[PDB]
Amino acid sequence: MTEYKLVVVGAVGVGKSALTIQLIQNHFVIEDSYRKQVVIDGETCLLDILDTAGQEEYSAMRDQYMRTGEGFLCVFAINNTKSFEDIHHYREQIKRVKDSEDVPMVLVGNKCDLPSRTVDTKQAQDLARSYGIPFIETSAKTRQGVDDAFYTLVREIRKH
Amino acid sequence: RRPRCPGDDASIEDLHEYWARLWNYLYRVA
Amino acid sequence: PRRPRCPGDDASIEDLHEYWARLWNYLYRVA
Ligand SMILES: Nc1nc2c(ncn2[C@@H]2O[C@H](COP(=O)(O)OP(=O)(O)O)[C@@H](O)[C@H]2O)c(=O)[nH]1
Ligand SMILES: [Ca+2]
Ligand SMILES: [Ca+2]
Ligand SMILES: [Ca+2]
Ligand SMILES: [Ca+2]
Ligand SMILES: [Mg+2]
């Protein structure tokens, strides 16, 4: 697998676009590019990123688009409890589309640079530990853990 | 905001780059 | 391994979807 399809899912305003932009460009503020060549664990690989945008809706095409993805990032905001609440929702949707219980997935806690938090790290770790998926706190603004989140998702795909 | 066609002279890499942008565009216009 | 042809501006969203599906299939087999 020299090529990887990655889909970023999450609530509106959690920073999915900012995470993708801070991966490709890579700076913090764009549909210019969604593709990057990087080296992970001594092996080069190409990454295609689907930055899911807009309200959730029924769509046969969107299902096909997500089904193309091999790995999924579940992003929530630490200052948004409601975004963390919807994590179970995005997970079930992914399992529904991929038609599998074991889908390569990584739980992402974004905006960890903000001093005011509503969801603690432990509460998020316990959720990811029950799913059997890794959990990484990221910050698109300070470019903290951005690469770590996507690269770990690549590891998850390689293990499966 | 629809991505321009890669063209006939486009290489495989150019097609991959286009496909990724088309991937996000098609999802968004649904 | 037939390279698909990119549709024009007159093309609909479905046309782009078709080309999207064909391109993915093409890029997979040539690689
Ligand atoms: N402090 C901070 N702000 C962020 C971060 N990620 C995104 N934002 C802010 O969130 C706003 C909207 O996020 P956006 O990427 O559009 O959310 P999306 O709906 O998932 O695409 C932007 O104006 C960013 O300034 C982060 O890691 N830290
Ligand atoms: Ca619809
Ligand atoms: Ca719609
Ligand atoms: Ca037509
Ligand atoms: Ca047609
Ligand atoms: Mg966005």
Numbering used by the authors:
A (entry chain A): 1 to 29, 36 to 166
B (entry chain B): 3 to 32
C (entry chain C): 2 to 32
Sentences from the paper on this structure:
As oncogenic Ras signaling is mediated by the GTP-bound state, we asked whether we could improve the nucleotide selectivity of the 225-11 miniprotein to favor binding to KRas-GppNHp. We prepared a scanning mutagenesis library that systematically randomized pairs of adjacent amino acids throughout the miniprotein sequence and then performed YSD with orthogonally labeled KRas-GppNHp and KRas-GDP targets. After two rounds of sorting for library members with improved selectivity for KRas-GppNHp, the screen afforded a population with a consensus mutation of A30R, located at the miniprotein residue closest to the γ-phosphate in the KRas/225-11 structure. A30R bound more strongly to both KRas-GppNHp and KRas-GDP but with a 2-fold overall improvement in selectivity for KRas-GppNHp. The crystal structure of 225-11 A30R bound to KRas-GppNHp revealed that the mutant arginine residue of the primary miniprotein protomer forms hydrogen bonds with two bound water molecules that solvate the γ-phosphate. GDP lacks the γ-phosphate, and Arg-30 is disengaged from the nucleotide in the KRas-GDP/225-11 A30R structure; thus, this interaction likely contributes to the improved nucleotide selectivity of this miniprotein mutant.
